[PDB]
């Protein structure tokens, strides 16, 4: 793998999606920009269990963007607190969680319909990543735009402990073009997004296992 002509990123233990989420052990890759992404077979995650029902398209899109360029946008989420600490996903000496998502639960044991809205003012497309926290008793989620309703229903049900946390953080993606206005509604446990990732128009991704070296 040559370095001089094209920008490579490698990654000890980060799958491209894990760097996208900002897993605590892969947090060093924030805001990184690349031309080609390269993936170790050692890749593993230490946070909450998770699953992207459209893994392939998300991988291709993020790789083609060639940038994370995250920017916190200060969504309202005023009704309840946006931080959440899990026994897994340890980062440091205490509990932690993804660095690009929220684990809302609901303060005062009540979850009002949040009805969050965020206008996409910029001239370039934006991508917002959110999830649904399948527990292990009530709640429905919907991410609405001018083109789709990414309806999701929390698939409640018991499950096997995977990292001492019997649940899932199923992750979806949402494009929000200029002029369109993201709309979000909820009734229960929602993995509230923290901010968009920019998209930039010939980068790609290759799953090579060659060593790392400095050469042309």
């Amino acid at each position: 793998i040559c370095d001089s002509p094209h920008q490579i990123l490698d990654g000890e233990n980060c799958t491209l999606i894990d760097a996208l989420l900002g897993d605590p052990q892969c947090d060093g890759f924030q805001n990184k920009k690349w031309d080609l992404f390269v993936e170790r077979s050692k890749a593993y995650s230490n946070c909450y269990p998770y699953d992207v029902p459209d893994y392939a398209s998300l991988r291709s899109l993020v790789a083609s963007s060639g940038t994370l360029e995250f920017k916190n946008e200060s969504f309202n989420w005023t009704g309840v607190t946006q931080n959440g600490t899990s026994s897994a996903c340890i980062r440091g000496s205490s509990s932690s969680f993804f660095s690009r998502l929220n684990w809302l639960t609901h303060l005062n044991y009540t979850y009002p319909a949040l009805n969050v809205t965020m206008p996409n003012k910029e001239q370039f497309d934006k991508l917002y990543i959110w999830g649904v926290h399948h527990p292990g008793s009530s709640g429905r989620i919907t991410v609405s735009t001018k083109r789709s309703q990414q309806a999701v229903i929390p698939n409640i049900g018991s499950r096997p402990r995977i990292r001492d946390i019997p649940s899932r953080i199923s992750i979806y993606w949402t494009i929000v073009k200029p002029g369109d206005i993201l709309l979000i509604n909820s009734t229960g446990n929602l993995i509230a997004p923290r901010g968009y990732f920019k998209i930039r128009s010939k980068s790609s991704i290759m799953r090579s296992d060659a060593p790392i070296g400095k050469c042309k």
Partner: antibody
Amino acid sequence: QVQLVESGGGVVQPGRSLRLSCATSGFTFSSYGIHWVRQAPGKGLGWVAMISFDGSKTYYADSVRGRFTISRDNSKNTLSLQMNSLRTEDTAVYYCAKERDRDGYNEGIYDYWGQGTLVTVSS
Amino acid sequence: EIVMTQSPATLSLSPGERATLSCRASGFYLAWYQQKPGQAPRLLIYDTSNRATGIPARFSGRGSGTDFTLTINSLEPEDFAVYYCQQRYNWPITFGQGTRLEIK
């Protein structure tokens, strides 16, 4: 070193009560969650039962749901899979398998096994 | 519980050749298990792409989207056995129906 032995298998008429015993040695029995796995002659494996960690929970499989009563006594380090209402689909070897982490942290991963006891049901 | 399928029940290949194993189920926690004929199975893989203790690096797991795969870059006589793909998401753990590697 840790080792597992299955016992009590053999021939029993359908519907008769049966109880395997899977003892353990080389580690404190509360250190892991126990399991049971089966395979009939010439077919693929299948799941049977489970105790999560320290015996406050149990979760069986579909085809055998409700029939069995897996239980343990932490003061003697002994496992048992109490069996009721045997049926002709239950001809197979029964392993008692452990997992690769303590107290329950990755449940669903097995590294240690016994030899596997044969249980046969027929006239 | 998911209905987990696997590659053809028997794949015949000569030692040293490259092999691939499929476990299309329709993303994570699909540990594989190795059993030698007449032996209690043993752990080979503990996640879609991570190897357990002692396994040679020749075995490599990849794939995602309920379309996982296990590619063997070079077979060895000890590799000719039965391989079952597990799955941990949801309570009922359903091993695949299994497949056999035979010395061609």
